[PDB]
Amino acid sequence: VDLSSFTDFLRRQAPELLPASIQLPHGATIVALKYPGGVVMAGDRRSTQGNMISGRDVRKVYITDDYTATGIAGTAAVAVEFARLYAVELEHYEKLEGVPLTFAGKINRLAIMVRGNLAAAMQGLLALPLLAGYDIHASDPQSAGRIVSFDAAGGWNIEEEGYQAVGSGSLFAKSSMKKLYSQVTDGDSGLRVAVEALYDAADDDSATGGPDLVRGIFPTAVIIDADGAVDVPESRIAELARAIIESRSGA
């Protein structure tokens, strides 16, 4: 049988290109939440090997097609490869079939890539992805946004709570959003609450780096609404960071 799967093709012809199976830099926190007519996703920039900081500019959130982005937390090499591979997989099906995969198909395809890595993940090469998307074919535009998390066995879940996080600081980030969520009423307030949850995670977890004002490195974010997925510009985030920081001091 033929599945127009770049990955399935790769396995038959090019196993070497695959991530494969059988300390490496890791440690990232990634959040995602739904706002009316939109979804936003953001991730920190740190990478650690044990106690040493190995990276401070790492991008972990990538737009994977016009209506979706993936954030991968875990081993950095694996996460980055997963991000590149999945995007090719998605555009490959579109070119072969002339039509993009349904949202549910995109999820299922990501789940198979995750699940097929469980062995490797047991050995430390973990990649736990978070998927954010807006569904055009969804019945209601306001409720279009989607957030999906994956457990290491490929099990996927579409959150109905409205927000989700993954990575070493994910518990902190989630508890923070639990309090801040009611304040989200539009893309800007949701983008504020996301950067704050990531701030809170960096506060309690040494593996998650918070905003570096000396070097000017900040979390990266992507927002997606009916007009597609767009990288949030650095300066809009920096401005949101200083607001939160300033606000944590006194004024």
Partner 1 sequence: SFPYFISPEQAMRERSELARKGIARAKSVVALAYAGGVLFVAENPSRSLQKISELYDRVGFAAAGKFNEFDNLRRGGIQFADTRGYAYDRRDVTGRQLANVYAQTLGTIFTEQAKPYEVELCVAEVAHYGETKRPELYRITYDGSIADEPHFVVMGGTTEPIANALKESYAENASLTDALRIAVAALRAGSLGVASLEVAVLDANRPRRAFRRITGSALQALLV
Q: How far is CA 216 from CA 45, 193, 233, 240, in A?
A: 11, 20, 13, 13
Distance (Å, rounded) from C-alpha 173 to C-alpha 83? 22
Residue 249 structure tokens = 């001091």
Nearer to a copy of itself, 173 or 223 (CB): 173
Distance (Å, rounded) from C-alpha 159 to C-alpha 107? 13
Distance (Å, rounded) from C-alpha 63 to C-alpha 4? 22
- Phi, then psi, of 208 in degrees rounded to 5: -105, 125
Distance (Å, rounded) from C-alpha 49 to C-alpha 58? 14
Residue 97's binding partner among partner 1, a copy of itself, none (Cβ under 5 to 8 angstroms by kind) is partner 1
* Residue of 174, 63, 83 lying closest to 128 (CA atoms): 83
**Minimum CB distance to partner 1, residue 244 (Å):** 33
**Site residues (CB under 8 A) for partner 1?**
1-6, 9-10, 13-14, 17, 84-85, 88, 91-92, 95-98, 101-102, 104-105, 108-109, 112
**Minimum CB distance to a copy of itself, residue 96 (Å):** 15
Nearer to partner 1, 88 or 245 (CB): 88
**Minimum CB distance to a copy of itself, residue 61 (Å):** 16
**Site residues (CB under 8 A) for a copy of itself?**
1, 3, 8-9, 11, 13-14, 16-17, 19-22, 24-25, 49, 54-55, 57-58, 75-78, 80-81, 112, 115-116, 118-119, 122, 125, 151-157, 160
Q: What contacts 28, CB < 8 A, 6 or more positions away? A: 43, 44, 46, 47, 58, 60, 72, 73, 74, 76, 79, 167, 168, 207, 208
The DSSP code for 183 is G
**Minimum CB distance to a copy of itself, residue 55 (Å):** 6
Nearer to a copy of itself, 9 or 228 (CB): 9
Task: Tell me the β-bridge partners of 223.
Answer: 40, 230
**Minimum CB distance to partner 1, residue 86 (Å):** 11
Nearer to a copy of itself, 56 or 242 (CB): 56
Nearer to a copy of itself, 22 or 251 (CB): 22
Nearer to a copy of itself, 23 or 235 (CB): 23
Q: Provide the phi-psi class of 60: left if phi over 0, else alpha when psi is between -120 and 50, else beta.
A: alpha
Residue 134's binding partner among partner 1, a copy of itself, none (Cβ under 5 to 8 angstroms by kind) is none
Residue 57's binding partner among partner 1, a copy of itself, none (Cβ under 5 to 8 angstroms by kind) is a copy of itself
**Minimum CB distance to partner 1, residue 234 (Å):** 19
